[PDB]
Amino acid sequence: AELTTLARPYAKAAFEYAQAHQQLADWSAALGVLAAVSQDDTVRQLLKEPQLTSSAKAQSLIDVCGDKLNAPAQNFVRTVAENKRLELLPTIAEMYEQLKAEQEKSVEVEVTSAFTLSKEQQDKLAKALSARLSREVRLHASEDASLIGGVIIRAGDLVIDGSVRGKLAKLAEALKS
Amino acid sequence: LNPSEISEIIKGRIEKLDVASQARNEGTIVSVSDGIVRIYGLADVMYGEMIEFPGGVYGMALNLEQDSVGAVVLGEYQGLAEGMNAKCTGRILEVPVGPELLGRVVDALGNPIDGKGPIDAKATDAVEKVAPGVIWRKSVDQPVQTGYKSVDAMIPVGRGQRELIIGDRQIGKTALAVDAIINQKDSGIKCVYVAIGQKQSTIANVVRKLEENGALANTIVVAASASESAALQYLAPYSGCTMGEYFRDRGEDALIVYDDLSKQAVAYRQISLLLRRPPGREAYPGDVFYLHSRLLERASRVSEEYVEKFTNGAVTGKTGSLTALPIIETQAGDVSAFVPTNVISITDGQIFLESAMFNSGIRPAVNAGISVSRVGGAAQTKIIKKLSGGIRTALAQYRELAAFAQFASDLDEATRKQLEHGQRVTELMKQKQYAPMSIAEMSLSLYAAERGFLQDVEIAKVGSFEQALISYFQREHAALLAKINEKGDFNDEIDAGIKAGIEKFKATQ
Amino acid sequence: MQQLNPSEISEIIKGRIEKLDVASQARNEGTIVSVSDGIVRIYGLADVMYGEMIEFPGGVYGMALNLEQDSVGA
Amino acid sequence: NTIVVAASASESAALQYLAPYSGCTMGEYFRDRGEDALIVYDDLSKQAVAYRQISLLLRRPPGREAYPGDVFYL
Amino acid sequence: AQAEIEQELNSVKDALRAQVGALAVTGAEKILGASIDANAHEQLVSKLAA
Amino acid sequence: AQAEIEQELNSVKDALRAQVGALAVTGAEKILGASIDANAHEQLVSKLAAEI
Amino acid sequence: SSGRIVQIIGAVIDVEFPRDAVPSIYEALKVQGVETTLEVQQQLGDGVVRSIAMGSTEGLKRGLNVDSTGAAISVPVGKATLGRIMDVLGNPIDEAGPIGEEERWGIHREAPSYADQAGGNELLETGIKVIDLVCPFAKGGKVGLFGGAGVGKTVNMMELIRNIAIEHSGYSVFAGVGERTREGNDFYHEMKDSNVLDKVALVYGQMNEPPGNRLRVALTGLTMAEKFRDEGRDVLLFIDNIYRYTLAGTEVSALLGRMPSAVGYQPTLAEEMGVLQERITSTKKGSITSIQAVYVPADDLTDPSPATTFAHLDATVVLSRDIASLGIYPAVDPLDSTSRQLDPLVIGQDHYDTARGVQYVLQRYKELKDIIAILGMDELSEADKLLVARARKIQRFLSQPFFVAEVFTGSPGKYVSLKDTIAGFKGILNGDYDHLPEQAFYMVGGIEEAVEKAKK
Amino acid sequence: SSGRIVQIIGAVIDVEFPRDAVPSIYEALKVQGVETTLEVQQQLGDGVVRSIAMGSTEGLKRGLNVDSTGAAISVPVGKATLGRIMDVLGNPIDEAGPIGEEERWGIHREAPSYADQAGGNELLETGIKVIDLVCPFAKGGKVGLFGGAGVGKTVNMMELIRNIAIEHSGYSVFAGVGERTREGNDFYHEMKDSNVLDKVALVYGQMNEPPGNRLRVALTGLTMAEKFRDEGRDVLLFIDNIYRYTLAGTEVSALLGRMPSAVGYQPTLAEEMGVLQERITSTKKGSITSIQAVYVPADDLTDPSPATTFAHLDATVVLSRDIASLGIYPAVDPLDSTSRQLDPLVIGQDHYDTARGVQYVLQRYKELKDIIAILGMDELSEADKLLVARARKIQRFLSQPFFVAEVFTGSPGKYVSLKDTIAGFKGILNGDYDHLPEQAFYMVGGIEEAVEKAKK
Numbered sequence A: 001a002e003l004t005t006l007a008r009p010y011a012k013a014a015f016e017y018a019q020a021h022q023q024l025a026d027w028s029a030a031l032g033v034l035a036a037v038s039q040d041d042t043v044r045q046l047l048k049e050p051q052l053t054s055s056a057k058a059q060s061l062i063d064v065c066g067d068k069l070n071a072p073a074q075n076f077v078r079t080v081a082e083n084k085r086l087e088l089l090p091t092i093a094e095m096y097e098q099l100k101a102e103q104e105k106s107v108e109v110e111v112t113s114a115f116t117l118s119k120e121q122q123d124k125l126a127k128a129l130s131a132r133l134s135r136e137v138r139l140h141a142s143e144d145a146s147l148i149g150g151v152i153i154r155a156g157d158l159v160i161d162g163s164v165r166g167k168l169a170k171l172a173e174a175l176k177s
Numbered sequence B: 001l002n003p004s005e006i007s008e009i010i011k012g013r014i015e016k017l018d019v020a021s022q023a024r025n026e027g028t029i030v031s032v033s034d035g036i037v038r039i040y041g042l043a044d045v046m047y048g049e050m051i052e053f054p055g056g057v058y059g060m061a062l063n064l065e066q067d068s069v070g071a072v073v074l075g076e077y078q079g080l081a082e083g084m085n086a087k088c089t090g091r092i093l094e095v096p097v098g099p100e101l102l103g104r105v106v107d108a109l110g111n112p113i114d115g116k117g118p119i120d121a122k123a124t125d126a127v128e129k130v131a132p133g134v135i136w137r138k139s140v141d142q143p144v145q146t147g148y149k150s151v152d153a154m155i156p157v158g159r160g161q162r163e164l165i166i167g168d169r170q171i172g173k174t175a176l177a178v179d180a181i182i183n184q185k186d187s188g189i190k191c192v193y194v195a196i197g198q199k200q201s202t203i204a205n206v207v208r209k210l211e212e213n214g215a216l217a218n219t220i221v222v223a224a225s226a227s228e229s230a231a232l233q234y235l236a237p238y239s240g241c242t243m244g245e246y247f248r249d250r251g252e253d254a255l256i257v258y259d260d261l262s263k264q265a266v267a268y269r270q271i272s273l274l275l276r277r278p279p280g281r282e283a284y285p286g287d288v289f290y291l292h293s294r295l296l297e298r299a300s301r302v303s304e305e306y307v308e309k310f311t312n313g314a315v316t317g318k319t320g321s322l323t324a325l326p327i328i329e330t331q332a333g334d335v336s337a338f339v340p341t342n343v344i345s346i347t348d349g350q351i352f353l354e355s356a357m358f359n360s361g362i363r364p365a366v367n368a369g370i371s372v373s374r375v376g377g378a379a380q381t382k383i384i385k386k387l388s389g390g391i392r393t394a395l396a397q398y399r400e401l402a403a404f405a406q407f408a409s410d411l412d413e414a415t416r417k418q419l420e421h422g423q424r425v426t427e428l429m430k431q432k433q434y435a436p437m438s439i440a441e442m443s444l445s446l447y448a449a450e451r452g453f454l455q456d457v458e459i460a461k462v463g464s465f466e467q468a469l470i471s472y473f474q475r476e477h478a479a480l481l482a483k484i485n486e487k488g489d490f491n492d493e494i495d496a497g498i499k500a501g502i503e504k505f506k507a508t509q
Numbered sequence C: 001m002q003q004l005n006p007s008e009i010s011e012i013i014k015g016r017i018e019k020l021d022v023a024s025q026a027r028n029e030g031t032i033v034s035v036s037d038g039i040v041r042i043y044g045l046a047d048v049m050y051g052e053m054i055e056f057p058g059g060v061y062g063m064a065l066n067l068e069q070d071s072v073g074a
Numbered sequence D: 001n002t003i004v005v006a007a008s009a010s011e012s013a014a015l016q017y018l019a020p021y022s023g024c025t026m027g028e029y030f031r032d033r034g035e036d037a038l039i040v041y042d043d044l045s046k047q048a049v050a051y052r053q054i055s056l057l058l059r060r061p062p063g064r065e066a067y068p069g070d071v072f073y074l
Numbered sequence E: 001a002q003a004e005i006e007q008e009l010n011s012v013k014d015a016l017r018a019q020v021g022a023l024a025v026t027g028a029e030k031i032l033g034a035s036i037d038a039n040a041h042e043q044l045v046s047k048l049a050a
Numbered sequence F: 001a002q003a004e005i006e007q008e009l010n011s012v013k014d015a016l017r018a019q020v021g022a023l024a025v026t027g028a029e030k031i032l033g034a035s036i037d038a039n040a041h042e043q044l045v046s047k048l049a050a051e052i
Numbered sequence G, H: 001s002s003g004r005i006v007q008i009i010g011a012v013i014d015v016e017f018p019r020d021a022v023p024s025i026y027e028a029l030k031v032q033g034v035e036t037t038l039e040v041q042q043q044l045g046d047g048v049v050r051s052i053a054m055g056s057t058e059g060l061k062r063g064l065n066v067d068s069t070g071a072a073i074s075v076p077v078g079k080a081t082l083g084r085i086m087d088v089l090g091n092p093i094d095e096a097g098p099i100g101e102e103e104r105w106g107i108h109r110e111a112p113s114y115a116d117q118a119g120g121n122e123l124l125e126t127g128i129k130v131i132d133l134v135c136p137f138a139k140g141g142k143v144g145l146f147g148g149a150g151v152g153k154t155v156n157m158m159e160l161i162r163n164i165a166i167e168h169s170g171y172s173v174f175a176g177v178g179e180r181t182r183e184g185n186d187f188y189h190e191m192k193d194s195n196v197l198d199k200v201a202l203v204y205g206q207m208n209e210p211p212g213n214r215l216r217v218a219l220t221g222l223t224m225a226e227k228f229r230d231e232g233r234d235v236l237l238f239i240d241n242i243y244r245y246t247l248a249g250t251e252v253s254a255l256l257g258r259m260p261s262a263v264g265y266q267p268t269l270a271e272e273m274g275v276l277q278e279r280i281t282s283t284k285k286g287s288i289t290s291i292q293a294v295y296v297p298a299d300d301l302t303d304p305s306p307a308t309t310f311a312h313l314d315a316t317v318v319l320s321r322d323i324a325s326l327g328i329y330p331a332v333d334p335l336d337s338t339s340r341q342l343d344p345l346v347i348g349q350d351h352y353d354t355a356r357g358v359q360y361v362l363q364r365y366k367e368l369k370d371i372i373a374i375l376g377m378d379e380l381s382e383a384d385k386l387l388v389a390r391a392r393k394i395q396r397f398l399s400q401p402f403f404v405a406e407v408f409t410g411s412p413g414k415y416v417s418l419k420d421t422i423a424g425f426k427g428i429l430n431g432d433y434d435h436l437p438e439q440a441f442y443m444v445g446g447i448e449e450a451v452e453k454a455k456k
């Protein structure tokens, strides 16, 4: 199975607890610290040792994380480790962030461009995307010398190609055929 | 020959290019194995939709799981790699349709492979369909003539009938179907020939024999040869069936050949076993009957009310039809195998070709004991239905008595005369490849067999007799043959003119 | 990296967030997770024996035949 | 004049699978120095059965009569 | 024979106009002369089509 | 006819080189139309320089 | 409340619902845009049900909203179904307006109880000689017509419809399950032309349909027959291919997550057969006489689908490709066809003794096939030669021209009474027609027509 | 960028790469520090490719660096391959230095297209009389070759190599699929002693090699034959067993864990046969004609491996022990060998009438030989004795001396044109040479050499 298929009910249980008890930012910081701690190489070598029990792996992760975990997050760590699902801990955190983006009505949008865009240009693209998607948007701008002009908007699976490289590929397909 | 101004087409293409941004739904390839690609993303894709890959490669979405999309590649998969982009097209799987495909050789997606330029089709239609229902059908009664004496006398095919052609390898299945295609060049019935799993030199020889006999301009050829992907071999009969259904839905008549449905079932078995689906008899999938039955139900005759409903009132008072001739290859005469028995349970009769009659020189090779048509004489013309009542019984009396010719001089009179009539009717049904006969010529041969004008003629001079009789009626009684070739009428005037011409042939020639 | 077991469902996991103790449910009681083709898979029933009768609502009875690590097939 | 190599029925399937190769190495000593040797493998069928046992217990994918794909190569 | 004359001739015209159209796309260096003043115009029409 | 198009091919190939620099300008004015006023100077040089 | 589509694999769709609003097993669901009906099979947990579509799934995407109807698939029942053609969902497909029904019934219900069963052995004469001889029928009984591809099953059913319609005055339900659309159009126009359409209700789910329609159409036809039975009437139920219900349960079985049984079948094969077949019976309220055609895959009778079908029936008629390859129609193997009405306390001693003597002579003829093939008839003994002669006359006299087979041959059809069949086969077994040639016994009605055919 | 070995299970090796540098399907990979080549079969995801090793994996570990070549397995092509033995990678396995090639080609390509087919049914003249009379070969055609061992298969192959090199200015490629090492060394020394080694390129994929080598060795030999076809020539391609190619596909598909098809075979059986056989065609530049020896499993012609192979074959040549015991060489059965080119539309009426007359006279002699064996020569009539004399003259005129068999016969070899074969066998069939003795017709070329043989 995929990692998202296995990571779906843990993120849904954590999101339903954090929406029921008004602790959304606490669990988002806790799952971010837990994902980043579980991707470090020394902790990953410790979590693959065969002589350790699952309770000692959960106790080592709780003792490493410390003050960034409240008591239901520690209960969540013991439930994840008892079902042998600790390698899912980045994917769980990512799916939690997706659920929180549907709850606060926001979408994370990546915009790539040929030259640097100013704040007026980002506010203009963000307002057009907020009118189209009916969500508060958050733009993340980046550069690319492969484009000769224009922008490329990526929002989830939605791709809007306004670059002239794509218009050059359309003209090449229109004159080749 | 080549002026420079006629290459200004490029400027006009620049004046019809839309450079506005359009929104797409996109994904990324995760894994490629054996023609099956798993894709992350593509959250708006539909079941059965074409998926665009780079390099002009398309796929079809089969497995819409919650976190991945499985797609089957409609072409060569070996240039596809992890990390490459996938796009939705908005289109359930389509082929171009129209009269512009007549004369052309295409692949399973309608792209031309003959080198004669682009196809300017004005319409596309879906590959996957459900056949029209119970109330929209009409019973079959118009004739389709194959031009063979044994087929048009004994097992007649009508407009809208499904008629299977089944038998062993290399005994003339492609030959009977291609000659049935060539006999439609002046009849108004348009033709589709689908080759599945055949060699390319065999396909090129078939299209050269179609052009040499003047029937290529009436025929669309769809080809998916033996080194293509199994997806295209699986999907080519439905694409050619949509190409025939264009002429079915507008009150016209078409005819399609699937020259191996047995290789299409092998290709669908390959696709299903690579998807790890659990198999049954002969490792075929459980829906393999459904694979043939979704296709052949589309061959039908539809009523005038269906044609008036489809064209929104444009075509009024006309029925349309699509006749099918599927072809099944057997192993050593085993007709009780799983795929042959699945296709018999679907068609309206079958024509069995026997290997022993082919190897003894009885070259159209039709086993009259077990070939049958469910429509029968409702489709036949009047003179052919009247004169073929005694053919099957003469061949029936020959079945067992054909081994008695080594001692037949010490037999009674009725057994000897039944065996002599059986040898004469058996020698009459032999026929060469690429020599079609009209209604009048088969009526002359059937009247020469049925009315006892073969009785004083020996066996080695039967068919030469037939040829000479045809030539005599072409130079003396040509208005009689033009009277018979109108709609196959029979009355006492035609009866008397035929019998007077045959008696003058037997007396003076 | 195996597939999802029948106790990996988010009310059960959210239950374990609210209280880690197994005594949230009694050892003679369980809850139906899944129903398919005469097979009922149940989370809980920690004191059940092989062949023991299980009481469902509506007068329906069942019998446990699979006693797995996380689930009971009846 | 004879070396006898034995891998009996109560020994490990790994030793029954390796015995023909070990006996072949002992026979090849004489071939590589310009002398002549003759070897008898009294059951190659049982060597294939022991290799089938090793391949099925290692969860390698089976084929015809549950033999692995490299039994011809064996 | 006359159909094969026209089909050979059309394959030559299609090959010549295919290589001329493949040469005109490769001359995109005019598009390489652009600055940010046309990029602001391109981002304006990317606003207008959403 | 194959021998005749062999004679005609060189003269039409010499006729096509006077039109391709206009073809790139006709495509480039559709793809980005904000530099159509500058391009009338640019085409007097680089019509050679991109063709070679 | 509303759910969302999370998975589409072929005909099988997974829909996620909220946790306090999960729909029950066999509940109908509706997609909000296209109006595709789904029927719930399984509850997987996590709010997700696994369902089978009653229609085409091309064009459907993940994320579509799905409503629940709160009940099962309900079809119109009663007087208004007569004369009309309907599909699996009860919608009319004959272009004749809406059905003016007064009530609708769900298609899933339990079998009637053991105390509600009705016994009876009153004979039903069919007019066909081999059927009235060796496997006789009863009113309120169950008939299977087993056979391979193109051996006759439909021709025999059309003859059984035509001859059972003579002495029956109630209603009829005809269910086409996975067969030819052209056969449905021919049977409808034949009943409309001869004015018997207003007694017969027609349900059709043919070979052109997606497998949910073929999986559930026989339940709809049986629900209409159950309403006619529970009004206290005597009704006829005809089902062309019951094998095609079973094969539709093959086509969705691995998509429902099941491990395969032997030769790739579904593991719930006998239970789906039992849940369908135990509703077909006569009760104490009213009676159902049922005729069902049963397909045999690759001519193998030990294939599990006919072998599970055999114990659900009162009378079993097995057809043979070898007997039809000899030219004998209706092609019934007399040594493989049994019925429970072949019993001396039902039919009498004379008819039973004639049937046992016919089966004895054909069994001893079947045991001599290889020695007749190798050495010939001449090296038998004299009583063996006489029994082979009487056996070939019995085999020729078991054939019969049919009224529905008049298009195939031109010979007129025959109706033979039971008394003439018993008297003719008794006269062949006693030696009264040892001077007749054997080809005079072929394709005649009575023994007197064989007497007139012998003088020709 | 390079990758690392993450898994070694047998010959199946998984190698992990960075995510922007995953190599293509069928790309050749090289293990650093070792002489091991891998061929990519599948892309599993997360940068990991699953591949088959083209040698022994003993001594390999996880963590070894693996370089990608950027292309498929590339073999040397051209005139430098002639006279040389090569493996599947094109490396020389004779001890004669490097191949001095000018060009290397990859072994995976498509079939020639529909517009690239040459057209017609042009015959390939072999110069052998029984082959050019009874079972004629097509340019671009495929020949099944049947028979056991010791009846002259290798001598027929060397005579076809010598005839296509000297009389038609073409070349030959041998591909030994599952080559026994003893017989390959014997075949190499037999081709040195018959002076035909420099006319043929040899590629062996031996029996003790892992089955991807035995799968791709025919593609290697077909790539060298394609370069020889693209120099404007007519090429012969010999495949030693096509069933070992099919079985190597079965073994490679079993190692990758694919679900097997009917009678144990790979589910891509027809596709892997078609990728090899559709590249052997006649194109507009030149042609490749293939001679492939066929093993039949369990003497079953309806087994899936010969049923997939016989769909591509255009002719069969059957070798017989009984013709070779009579001293007649080559030992081709004229009654059991078939051809699709033996058809009067293909070769004309005259060649067809001569070949069917020879086949009728030999079939009538075959049954009259049993008549003479059962009752003696005095049972036959004057016309039967005349046919026996003409048939023995036909049977001895089918023999022919070969240029590669001059040690055996003690005679010069002969090349016979097709015109002389039809004229000579027509001259025997019309009774023009009944005055000659039968021993003049043994081991000559044309009919005139038999005429000058009957003066001595």
Ligand SMILES: Nc1ncnc2c1ncn2[C@@H]1O[C@H](COP(=O)(O)OP(=O)(O)OP(=O)(O)O)[C@@H](O)[C@H]1O
Residues within 6 Å of the ligand: B168, B169, B170, B171, B172, B173, B174, B175, B176, B363, B364, B431, B432, B433, H340, H343, H345
């Ligand atoms: N009526 C005929 N008279 C003489 N020869 C015929 C006739 N019909 C077919 N043949 C010959 O029979 C041969 C086999 O025919 P054909 O190729 O149609 O067979 P097939 O069963 O379709 O074979 P394939 O396995 O290639 O599909 C051909 O060489 C053809 O010329």
Ligand SMILES: Nc1ncnc2c1ncn2[C@@H]1O[C@H](COP(=O)(O)OP(=O)(O)O)[C@@H](O)[C@H]1O
Residues within 6 Å of the ligand: B345, B372, B373, B374, G147, G148, G149, G150, G151, G152, G153, G154, G155, G156, G329, G330, G402, G405, G408
């Ligand atoms: N009683 C009969 N008389 C003559 N021919 C028959 C008879 N029954 C069947 N046949 C022949 O067999 C064919 C197949 O019959 P059908 O009932 O359609 O078979 P099935 O239902 O088993 O597929 C008929 O179309 C006809 O040619």
Ligand SMILES: Nc1ncnc2c1ncn2[C@@H]1O[C@H](COP(=O)(O)OP(=O)(O)O)[C@@H](O)[C@H]1O
Residues within 6 Å of the ligand: H148, H149, H150, H151, H152, H153, H154, H155, H156, H329, H330, H402, H405, H408, H409
């Ligand atoms: N053309 C021929 N003339 C005479 N003898 C031959 C000829 N071909 C084969 N033979 C005899 O048949 C034997 C077997 O030939 P060969 O081709 O080596 O078969 P194989 O390769 O299967 O062993 C040879 O030893 C030779 O004596």
Ligand SMILES: [Mg+2]
Residues within 6 Å of the ligand: G153, G154, G155, G179
């Ligand atoms: Mg039927």
